[PDB]
Amino acid sequence: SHMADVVVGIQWGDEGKGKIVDRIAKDYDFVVRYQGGHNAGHTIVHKGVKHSLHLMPSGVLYPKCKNIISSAVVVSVKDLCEEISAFEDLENRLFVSDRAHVILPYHAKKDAFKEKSQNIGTTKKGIGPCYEDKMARSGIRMGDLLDDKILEEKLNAHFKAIEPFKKAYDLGENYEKDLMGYFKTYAPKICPFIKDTTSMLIEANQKGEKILLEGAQGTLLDIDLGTYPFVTSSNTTSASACVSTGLNPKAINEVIGITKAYSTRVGNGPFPSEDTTPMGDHLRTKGAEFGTTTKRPRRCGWLDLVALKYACALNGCTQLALMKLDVLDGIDAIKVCVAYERKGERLEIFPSDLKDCVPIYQTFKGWEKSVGVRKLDDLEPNVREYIRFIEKEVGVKIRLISTSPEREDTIFL
Amino acid sequence: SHMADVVVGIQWGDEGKGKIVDRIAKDYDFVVRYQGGHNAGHTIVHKGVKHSLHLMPSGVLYPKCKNIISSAVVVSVKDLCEEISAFEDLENRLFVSDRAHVILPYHAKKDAFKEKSQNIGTTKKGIGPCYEDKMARSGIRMGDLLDDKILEEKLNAHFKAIEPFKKAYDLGENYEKDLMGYFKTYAPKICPFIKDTTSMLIEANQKGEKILLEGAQGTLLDIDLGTYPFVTSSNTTSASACVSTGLNPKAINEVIGITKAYSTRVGNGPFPSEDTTPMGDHLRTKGAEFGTTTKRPRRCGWLDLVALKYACALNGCTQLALMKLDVLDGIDAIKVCVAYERKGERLEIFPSDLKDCVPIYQTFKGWEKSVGVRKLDDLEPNVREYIRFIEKEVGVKIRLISTSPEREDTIFL
Ligand SMILES: Nc1nc2c(ncn2[C@@H]2O[C@H](COP(=O)(O)OP(=O)(O)O)[C@@H](O)[C@H]2O)c(=O)[nH]1
Ligand SMILES: Nc1nc2c(ncn2[C@@H]2O[C@H](COP(=O)(O)OP(=O)(O)O)[C@@H](O)[C@H]2O)c(=O)[nH]1
Ligand SMILES: O=c1[nH]cnc2c1ncn2[C@@H]1O[C@H](COP(=O)(O)O)[C@@H](O)[C@H]1O
Ligand SMILES: O=c1[nH]cnc2c1ncn2[C@@H]1O[C@H](COP(=O)(O)O)[C@@H](O)[C@H]1O
Ligand SMILES: [Ca+2]
Ligand SMILES: [Ca+2]
């Protein structure tokens, strides 16, 4: 247990990771995004001002933090440049790994094309196809932008390899021209931020500096251990934070699992505790469970402790942050899935195939007014019973409770 | 830091991981292969009998051990069944993850095709292309073989999708019918071994059972942090052992880095300490550096402490095993690369681009007769000083010393 703490979403994303990272970031020297891409959307709100970050790490509102975009991330350079322009004096407080892979316009076109047959429900941003080119070892990395010679060589090889797909993926007649001009525009803007971030973090850890690792997506979206194939293409577990930053597993200190008080997922795939009745629509409305751009409605349902115990085991959570209790204000009865029923069998442990798994619910008396509460003793007795039940059943202590989007509407326990 | 120990190769593979795992496995309840495929070849020798293992974990010679092939591995079913047939009574001591992905004949054909332009020097076994289909979320997994109907639907989608490539990858006209029969032959043989190994290791961790995780390839072949693109398509460091196994970073106890007393790599890519003179041929001859399918001569060179210190930081090694000291018997002067130089500038730290990096060598007086020695006190003084230098420079204690292929020719310190 060295100096590196990890924030991980333990459901299917959108749990409130951005809020928690921004709440705690001021006490860290480094804040690190370690996987995924701009498929992520992490929303921070403070004093009535909202920021929705996609690749920019969530320490950006504290100019003393050094924000790192690490090697297992996939980068859309134009979108990252558009984020950089929203903040002042990022030059010595944002660093992008020279080993991170680059998302090309072909990637999103391929994503949309494959989605016609696979119907996973991806964000159509080309995340998966970028990771495919990484495994092929044909992908372009951010360090390649530092030398026009190699970038040209690599683009030309890309140009020759995508030609049998120009018709299938609707690439266009100006693909080569437009891509070459894309890098002419964006490479000069991003190049000063490209660094060996592996060495930076190896040295920071050896020097005992405080490092916060910001997960994206959620544990149940993990490429290996999630609800495959309804998953993202990166590993999302806490150990993924070591795999590609330079830090080793023995550096990991606290593992903070972020869970909502109910469940959401966006996109297709299994969802044992989903609620498609008007009560599920109530959760969506009161929880504002729509896209970052307010477009993609989420599937909504109840908290699922079978899946939470599984995710907590995969990450080694030492604490939980319980988010959005205020969305449940005014609901008369709150259900929690405590086990699955499968063809007469009661399953206490999350199975590798959720086929025929029906939720078994325990019901809790509802509460009225948790919104904005900042003190434990101000919480209603019924909410405190709900919180106590979760800690006891999952076996991980709840150390943070959020009661609104606002940074300071957070109780520390 | 609980009960899971990790053995990791800290160079470019072939360091002696199979020997070390077999030497220590008897004291463990589980022995787990966690990434790669049958590109691995782990050689164990005991009492003049050799076993060359490819996907079989190296606990197989102790029937009380439970051997696990975990979820991030890629499985060639035919080759695994051929390994199964060489041992007696594997049924309750070998378990294959229902989440592991399956290598199809298409994959090796695509591998050879892409190699014509990329010239990485892969093993041509389809490892990379299998990982690509994983990222695409179109890949077939071991659990799919347990249900005839699901396997049918997935093989159909695969046949459809590979239509455009039948000519380009030299797929036969009999591809569909051959693969159909392949699974009719091999799925019955492998089905009894398919299990939810994620749940097995979650429970093993919770019960405090002793787990040994066996890495494949080596740290400098890591897809993210190795000598890209001259790497394998999986993560190879100790953190990968708790990404996809059902363990988590807090479970990792000892991390044993396996290093040869000199260096090899097979395939193309940078190699700062390579020796292409007749002394390099001598290392190849004396070290039998030709592989399992003895038709792949290795590139050889000297120990590189710059790369070694980098690999130890990425893995968090707590002890080192120094292998093949006996290969250096009779060499008058042993070189160790202690630093790099780049265009006249000295570099202490392993850089992200090895272009123009040349070795700075310190030389050591050689020895004559380390072969087969079993007590530290019986080693020649020059051997002892070489060992002390490595551990002092790298900062990790050398706790195992190997002096021949035989299991028992191993010194414990
Ligand atoms: N009502 C309420 N909203 C919250 C709370 N915490 C976060 N929010 C908001 O809920 C949304 C969280 O979804 P998102 O930002 O996608 O989560 P992330 O991806 O894990 O950072 C955002 O709109 C936050 O502003 C909370 O405790 N109560
Ligand atoms: N001369 C000598 N050979 C060894 C020693 N340890 C292992 N070997 C052999 O060296 C080879 C190691 O390469 P390999 O099996 O591919 O290593 P792995 O992939 O890391 O298990 C094998 O042929 C082993 O039998 C040693 O200490 N001395
Ligand atoms: O922003 C996120 N919030 C919630 N789910 C996401 C997010 N980004 C990707 N996913 C999910 O991850 C899966 C794969 O999408 P991809 O990451 O775009 O490939 C789908 O289920 C997505 O909805
Ligand atoms: O058996 C191994 N020993 C040494 N190198 C290996 C082994 N397996 C794969 N590699 C190396 O890993 C790289 C990629 O090969 P692939 O794993 O077949 O994709 C090449 O440099 C290979 O030589
Ligand atoms: Ca989100
Ligand atoms: Ca080997």
Residue numbers in the entry:
A (entry chain A), B (entry chain B): -1 to 411
List sentences from the manuscript.
Adenylosuccinate synthetase (AdSS) participates in both biosynthesis and salvage pathways of purines. Helicobacter pylori adenylosuccinate synthetase (AdSS) is present in solution in a dynamic equilibrium of monomers and biologically active homodimers. The addition of the His6-tag on the C-terminus (C-His-AdSS) was proven to have a negligible effect on the characteristics of this enzyme. This paper shows that the same enzyme with the His6-tag fused on its N-terminus (N-His-AdSS) has a high tendency to precipitate.
Two monomers of the enzyme occupy the asymmetric unit, forming a catalytically active dimer, with the Arg135 side chain participating in building the active site of the neighboring monomer. N-His-AdSS enzyme was incubated with GTP, IMP, Had (hadacidin, analog of Asp), and MgCl2 during crystallization, just like the C-His-AdSS variant was. However, clearly defined electron density for the Had molecule (HDA in the PDB denotation) is not visible in the structure. The shape of the electron density blob found in the approximate Asp-binding site of N-His-AdSS fits one sulfate ion, which could originate from the crystallization solution containing 0.2 M ammonium sulfate. One additional sulfate ion is found in the active site exactly at the position, which is occupied by the 6-Pi group of 6-P-IMP (IMO in the PDB denotation) in the structure of the C-His-AdSS variant. In accordance with the missing Had molecule, in the N-His-AdSS structure, the Asp-binding loop (residues 289–294) is moved away from the active site (Cα of Thr291 moved by 6.1 Å) and is poorly defined in the electron density. The electron density blob in the supposed Mg-binding site did not fit the Mg ion, so the Ca ion was placed there instead, as it made a much better match. The calcium ion is coordinated with six oxygen atoms: from α- and β-phosphate of GDP, the backbone carbonyl group of Gly39, the side-chain carbonyl group of Asp12, and two sulfate ions present in the active site in the places of Had and 6-Pi group of 6-P-IMP. Since no His6-tag handle is visible in the N-His-AdSS structure, it can be concluded that it is too flexible to be observed, and obviously not so firmly bound to the protein as in the mentioned case of G. stearothermophilus purine nucleoside phosphorylase. The buried surface area between monomers in the structure of N-His-AdSS is 2422 Å2 (as calculated with Pisa, version 1.52), which compares well with 2342 Å2 calculated for the structure of C-His-AdSS.
